[PDB]
Amino acid sequence: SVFSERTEESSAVQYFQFYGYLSQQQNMMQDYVRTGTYQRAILQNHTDFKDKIVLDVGCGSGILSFFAAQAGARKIYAVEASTMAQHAEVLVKSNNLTDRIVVIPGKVEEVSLPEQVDIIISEPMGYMLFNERMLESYLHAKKYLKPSGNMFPTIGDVHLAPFTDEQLYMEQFTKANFWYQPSFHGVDLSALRGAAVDEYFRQPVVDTFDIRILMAKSVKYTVNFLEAKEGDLHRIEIPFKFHMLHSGLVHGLAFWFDVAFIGSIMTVWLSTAPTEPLTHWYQVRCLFQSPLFAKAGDTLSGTCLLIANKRQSYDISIVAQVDQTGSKSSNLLDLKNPFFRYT
Amino acid sequence: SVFSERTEESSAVQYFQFYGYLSQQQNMMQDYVRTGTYQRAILQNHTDFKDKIVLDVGCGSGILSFFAAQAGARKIYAVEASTMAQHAEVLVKSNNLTDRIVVIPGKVEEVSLPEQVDIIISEPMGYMLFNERMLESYLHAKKYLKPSGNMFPTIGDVHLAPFTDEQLYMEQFTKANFWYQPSFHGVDLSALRGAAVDEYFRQPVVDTFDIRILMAKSVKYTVNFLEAKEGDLHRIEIPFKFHMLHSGLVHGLAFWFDVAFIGSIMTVWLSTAPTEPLTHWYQVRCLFQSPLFAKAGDTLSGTCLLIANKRQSYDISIVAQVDQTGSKSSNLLDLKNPFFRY
Amino acid sequence: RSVFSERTEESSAVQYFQFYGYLSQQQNMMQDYVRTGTYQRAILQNHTDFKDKIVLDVGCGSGILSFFAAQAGARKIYAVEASTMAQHAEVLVKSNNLTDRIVVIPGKVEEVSLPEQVDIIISEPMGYMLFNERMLESYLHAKKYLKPSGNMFPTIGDVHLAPFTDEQLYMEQFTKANFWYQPSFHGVDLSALRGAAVDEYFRQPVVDTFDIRILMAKSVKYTVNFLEAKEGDLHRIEIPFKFHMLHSGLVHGLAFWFDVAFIGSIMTVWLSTAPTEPLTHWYQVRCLFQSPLFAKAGDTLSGTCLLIANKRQSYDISIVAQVDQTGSKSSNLLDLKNPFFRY
Amino acid sequence: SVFSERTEESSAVQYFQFYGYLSQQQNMMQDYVRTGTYQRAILQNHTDFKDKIVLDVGCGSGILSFFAAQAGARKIYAVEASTMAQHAEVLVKSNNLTDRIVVIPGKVEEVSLPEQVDIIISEPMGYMLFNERMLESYLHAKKYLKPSGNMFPTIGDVHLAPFTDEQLYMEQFTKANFWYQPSFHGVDLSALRGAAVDEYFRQPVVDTFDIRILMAKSVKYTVNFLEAKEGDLHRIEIPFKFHMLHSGLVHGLAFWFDVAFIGSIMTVWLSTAPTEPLTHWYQVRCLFQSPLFAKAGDTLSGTCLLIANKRQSYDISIVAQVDQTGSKSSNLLDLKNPFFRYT
Numbered sequence A, D: 001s002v003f004s005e006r007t008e009e010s011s012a013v014q015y016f017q018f019y020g021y022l023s024q025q026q027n028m029m030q031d032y033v034r035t036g037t038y039q040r041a042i043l044q045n046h047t048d049f050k051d052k053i054v055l056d057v058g059c060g061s062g063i064l065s066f067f068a069a070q071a072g073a074r075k076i077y078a079v080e081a082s083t084m085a086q087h088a089e090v091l092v093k094s095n096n097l098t099d100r101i102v103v104i105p106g107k108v109e110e111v112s113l114p115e116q117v118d119i120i121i122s123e124p125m126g127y128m129l130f131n132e133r134m135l136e137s138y139l140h141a142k143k144y145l146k147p148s149g150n151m152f153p154t155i156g157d158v159h160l161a162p163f164t165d166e167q168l169y170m171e172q173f174t175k176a177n178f179w180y181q182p183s184f185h186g187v188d189l190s191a192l193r194g195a196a197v198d199e200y201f202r203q204p205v206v207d208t209f210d211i212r213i214l215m216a217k218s219v220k221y222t223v224n225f226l227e228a229k230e231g232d233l234h235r236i237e238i239p240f241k242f243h244m245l246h247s248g249l250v251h252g253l254a255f256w257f258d259v260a261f262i263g264s265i266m267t268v269w270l271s272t273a274p275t276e277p278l279t280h281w282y283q284v285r286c287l288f289q290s291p292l293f294a295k296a297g298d299t300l301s302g303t304c305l306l307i308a309n310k311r312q313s314y315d316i317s318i319v320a321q322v323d324q325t326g327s328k329s330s331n332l333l334d335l336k337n338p339f340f341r342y343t
Numbered sequence B: 001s002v003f004s005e006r007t008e009e010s011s012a013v014q015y016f017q018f019y020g021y022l023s024q025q026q027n028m029m030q031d032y033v034r035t036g037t038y039q040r041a042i043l044q045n046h047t048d049f050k051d052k053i054v055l056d057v058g059c060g061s062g063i064l065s066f067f068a069a070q071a072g073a074r075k076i077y078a079v080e081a082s083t084m085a086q087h088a089e090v091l092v093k094s095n096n097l098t099d100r101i102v103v104i105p106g107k108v109e110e111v112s113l114p115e116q117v118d119i120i121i122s123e124p125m126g127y128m129l130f131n132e133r134m135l136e137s138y139l140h141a142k143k144y145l146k147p148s149g150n151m152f153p154t155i156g157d158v159h160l161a162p163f164t165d166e167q168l169y170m171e172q173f174t175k176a177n178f179w180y181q182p183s184f185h186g187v188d189l190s191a192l193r194g195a196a197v198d199e200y201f202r203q204p205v206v207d208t209f210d211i212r213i214l215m216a217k218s219v220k221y222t223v224n225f226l227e228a229k230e231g232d233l234h235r236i237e238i239p240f241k242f243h244m245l246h247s248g249l250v251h252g253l254a255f256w257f258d259v260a261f262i263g264s265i266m267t268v269w270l271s272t273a274p275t276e277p278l279t280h281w282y283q284v285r286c287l288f289q290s291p292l293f294a295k296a297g298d299t300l301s302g303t304c305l306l307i308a309n310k311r312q313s314y315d316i317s318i319v320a321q322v323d324q325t326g327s328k329s330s331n332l333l334d335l336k337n338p339f340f341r342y
Numbered sequence C: 001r002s003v004f005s006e007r008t009e010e011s012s013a014v015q016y017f018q019f020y021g022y023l024s025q026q027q028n029m030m031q032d033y034v035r036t037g038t039y040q041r042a043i044l045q046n047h048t049d050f051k052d053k054i055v056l057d058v059g060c061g062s063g064i065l066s067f068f069a070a071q072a073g074a075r076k077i078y079a080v081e082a083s084t085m086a087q088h089a090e091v092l093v094k095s096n097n098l099t100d101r102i103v104v105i106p107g108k109v110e111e112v113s114l115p116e117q118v119d120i121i122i123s124e125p126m127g128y129m130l131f132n133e134r135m136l137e138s139y140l141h142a143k144k145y146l147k148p149s150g151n152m153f154p155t156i157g158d159v160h161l162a163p164f165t166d167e168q169l170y171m172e173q174f175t176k177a178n179f180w181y182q183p184s185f186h187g188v189d190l191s192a193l194r195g196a197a198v199d200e201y202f203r204q205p206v207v208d209t210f211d212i213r214i215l216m217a218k219s220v221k222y223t224v225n226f227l228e229a230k231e232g233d234l235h236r237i238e239i240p241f242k243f244h245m246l247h248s249g250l251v252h253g254l255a256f257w258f259d260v261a262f263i264g265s266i267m268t269v270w271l272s273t274a275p276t277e278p279l280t281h282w283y284q285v286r287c288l289f290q291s292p293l294f295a296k297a298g299d300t301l302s303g304t305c306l307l308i309a310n311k312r313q314s315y316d317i318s319i320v321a322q323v324d325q326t327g328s329k330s331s332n333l334l335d336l337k338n339p340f341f342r343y
């Protein structure tokens, strides 16, 4: 199948074991911004669901399908690949909705639906939007979408912005300098100090921050789920040209994302921006190996290249340069293993 | 190999991927009780290493091998299956010990060792001692051990004792009670509450605690690493009979462990007991879904059964009984996925 | 049979009037200084409403309010009491030399015969959550003896209800119900009765006081005008509510209290049992939800509190509540006659 | 039936309503001394239950029947008159003992048992043993007992002892002196002070105390449930003659009770003595109207006469006298309405 070919078996096992936990579902469900906004987006666009055929990609507990049922849906196919599918089925029965919601255990790339659907709903967003590579499942599912069919969410915007955070940058060296001692119990650890620094900088940092560390207006990269193909997400090139609003040292790039539910009645936005109330996605920061000095008015140009890997994530390549000075910095990061810094 | 047959590929990949990180090595190395006690046990028993052949099972960064080198060992084979092995090689070169420490990359069940060794050193203890199933690798490695060779550590004591902690219990019960709601955003979740309680209580709690929550003298289960066979750890049955010292609610069993380095000069103990300074093993508690009320003087009887699984851990079944009232409790826990509360 | 006996089980009535036959209970009520003091002020500061008037005291007990009416210059006071306390009231009338002003009439106010119509009716018919004991109906029934322009002391009653958060109370009750969760109490599996146990405990309104900050919204007020209301109005009391949540959190239930007003010719005097006011022997009453409802600030909590009078001189309470923004719903049934005294 | 003739209808209603609550059953079940001792007495005398026919009088939740089942009983008839009977049925089913425990709804004086039993088990004890008059139900049940049959408990001992408690005695007057004031809000209450004192002294005091207040070894009155008639409990005359161990003022008599389970293997005792751990029965004290002075070595003689009434309780008559001085005191108390003093 399409899923197995793009996914290492070891990664897939871990991945679906993770979502097999009721606590993990619960964690997502208790993210009120997320869950509430989904329910709002569905109910406020009830004309998009009333007596419609619905597909829920990766239903988990089945909560979105229930929201679709609340909106008056006729039939909802709730596809789930982890063992959570059995718990979703129990909920369908206990909520007396067996006539409207059909839980289909398995990967959306492998299961079969009896009919085409009017609208696809899903929550496939990971860290930096693209983590977990579930957007491709979401896009793959369009084989079951009627022409003129709709997608909830419909589009996704990932935002990038340069930031200054001296403490975050110095923190890495403070942690790596553990190895920079000549006699740890009689052992000289110094030779590994470089490797330690390297390791720390490969980890994207997950947490939140004050918006005042941002030094330029964000650059936006948009995915239209109605138009995109899964293969479009294998190689994501995000060019940027930041016009610096403040003078100072750029320590790296901050990432966040919005999704839009473009319905017939209204468009509802779900945002994980640092200007908005915190979600379980927080924000993500990728550090530069060497900070870049910029004057207000200077331009910071370059590219953020996301390359999909078989561990259900992306290898991040970031190249940036201050055009006025030619001062350049790059970093390679491993999105699969972020550092959860939030406290 | 013996490792591969008893281990799911999915588990091993993640497992050794985890130990390839320098931050994790730093975390373990910064456990001063551990590192200091190991160095203490090796250096003070230097005659057990002087001009001897040493095997370091799961050497990681190689610290124990350096300790063995400090004790005057002639040759040390440092085996590590994670990529950390490459970092160990770097330290050996930079510490000018290339003539004495030989890093052998790979699983100890799969590598080929050049010669038989006089002594095996290792740090194979996981949470509640048995987690990670590395003790079996440690035991497996005795195929390279000379007839009268030694092992560091030499023995392991697992201690279990009944505890009372309403706060911890309610803390987990609260998390499970989310699945109690009859109308979460209009959705009835209650039918899953049973499965939810089951899931949360299967998680052993890793953290530390005050010793005054303990309601009886601990029961000891000992593994002699010099004598034990790999197969001995597939099924670990620990019967217990506690004489309750305090009245109250028994919320579960607390676990910790000691290991002893029985050398020629002296025996050095490394303890993770809650009466001792804290280590990175902390202590482990297994909660009962329903606590058992017991009075002082009662006997708390039952069995703690550990069944090894293919995910490099154990399925824990605890059956406990207040003999005077017949109050019985049964519990199943997944040692692989503990709750880190510390 | 009289209107009283038909709406009252004899078994309940016996216990009820037997309870009020005890001097200790009279002492308990009389030692409520807020209560007694406020009644005395309401009567004395409106002395013109009593001067040379004919008074009816419904459920006079020890006769304290009749003495207050006598102090304000009443010509004759008919003090009706159905319990044996009537005998003690008479003793006080004689020992206080007020035989020419206070006439104790033993019996139920629904059954006795008065020689004449009265200018004003005084009573203290309030129970827990105002309506408990169903004496308001006796109070209203007595209006058959009231002259057309007659007055009522108290004149009006306000019931206040507001949502509250109190995790401590909820877990306190939940823990008590969880006794029946034990699978091996002395070797016996009790679990099958947990549902019945939870139901039983949560049917008990909690009588006590609390800090006002646990309240999550402005109280909704329901008013009974004793000058206009008829007995039948209290047989089935429907109180709709729409709360605008001021705080985010878990709604564990609804808090209840009441005010009564003595609207006299000289001034209006209020007797309040609100948690913002000094504590009375009425305390406050809280009705718990079996499972709390999550609400954000700005949300609306709407629904209905329905009180159905029963033959045990109390009410069957039904509370239906809903977080409108999410559709999160709770339904609960309570037995007001058997509250939990927590103070 | 025998029950209805000796019981006022009004009393019976509240009585069985009281035991219809799971919380009250729970209250009894959480008395570890009581429940544990019952279980222990049954299990340690397993030969008295093995393959026997058992009768459980007033099974409540059915706990004692389950204990009988644990001891290997062949058939257990669990008779229960309150609504608790249905909850017992639920527990029997849920514990898979449907073939061995049969729940019979109704009063034991009115139901029909298909066969005679080998042993009757019950927990019919109230305050000072005899309150609630359920022992008569217990003894009545022997009509279903084989001639060679046993009773669990087998005997009941009531202990009586003189006590000194200056605080308790003075407390009555302190509470009554509320009424001894000439202008309570302008009212002279003094005329009721006597009636108030009378009221307090009629109430036996339920609570516990330090054994240091006891001034003589208790006098014991024994009921052998194997030998006794129902009628033996209609009029209970307990003569007493105490040999005073301490000098001082005797303010009244303290009451407690024991029951013994005399089985074939061993005799197990359940005690509510103040020398033993506290149970939900506590202890009961009856005050003398006027305290009696006695020296150590004097004899305190008299009678405690318990006269059964139709309110499922007893009128307590106490006459006591110091023989050496002729100093005499009496009290008449209403056991149905005790004062719960325990804190």
Ligand SMILES: COCn1cc(CNC[C@H]2O[C@@H](n3cnc4c(N)ncnc43)[C@H](O)[C@@H]2O)c(N)nc1=O
Pocket (backbone or CB within 6 Å): B003, B016, B019, B028, B057, B058, B059, B060, B079, B080, B081, B082, B084, B106, B107, B108, B109, B123, B124, B125, B126, B127, B132, B134, B137, B280, B281
């Ligand atoms: C819960 O505590 C975690 N923990 C675990 C351990 C156990 N030691 C694991 C170390 O040993 C390595 N290891 C595990 N199984 C191995 C095997 N078949 N062959 C070779 N190396 C192996 C593994 O890669 C790591 O470097 C420890 N020594 N300290 C700890 O803190």
Ligand SMILES: COCn1cc(CNC[C@H]2O[C@@H](n3cnc4c(N)ncnc43)[C@H](O)[C@@H]2O)c(N)nc1=O
Pocket (backbone or CB within 6 Å): C004, C017, C020, C029, C058, C059, C060, C061, C080, C081, C082, C083, C085, C107, C108, C109, C110, C124, C125, C126, C127, C128, C133, C135, C138, C281, C282
């Ligand atoms: C929480 O207790 C509420 N509560 C109620 C009351 C109301 N009861 C006062 C007095 O009213 C008497 N009473 C009740 N229904 C009556 C009736 N049809 N006819 C005559 N007397 C009646 C009853 O004998 C009692 O002595 C009060 N005076 N204080 C209170 O505290």
Ligand SMILES: Nc1ncnc2c1ncn2[C@@H]1O[C@H](CSCC[C@H]([NH3+])C(=O)O)[C@@H](O)[C@H]1O
Pocket (backbone or CB within 6 Å): A003, A016, A019, A028, A029, A057, A058, A059, A060, A061, A062, A063, A064, A079, A080, A081, A082, A084, A106, A107, A108, A109, A122, A123, A124, A134, A137
């Ligand atoms: N290819 C796939 N096919 C089916 N389910 C998948 C696939 N990839 C991910 N999932 C599931 O999709 C879910 C994403 S988490 C979202 C859970 C739930 N729909 C909610 O909105 O709260 C997880 O439960 C995954 O197990």
Ligand SMILES: Nc1ncnc2c1ncn2[C@@H]1O[C@H](CSCC[C@H]([NH3+])C(=O)O)[C@@H](O)[C@H]1O
Pocket (backbone or CB within 6 Å): D003, D016, D019, D028, D029, D057, D058, D059, D060, D061, D062, D063, D064, D079, D080, D081, D082, D084, D106, D107, D108, D109, D122, D123, D124, D134, D137
């Ligand atoms: N005459 C009677 N017939 C049947 N049941 C009765 C009678 N009198 C009292 N009971 C019940 O006897 C019980 C006394 S409480 C003892 C309950 C239970 N056997 C236990 O040991 O925990 C109550 O549940 C009463 O409803």
Ligand code: NA
Pocket (backbone or CB within 6 Å): B271, B272, B273, B274, B275, B276, B277, B278, B279, B282
């Ligand atoms: Na320790």
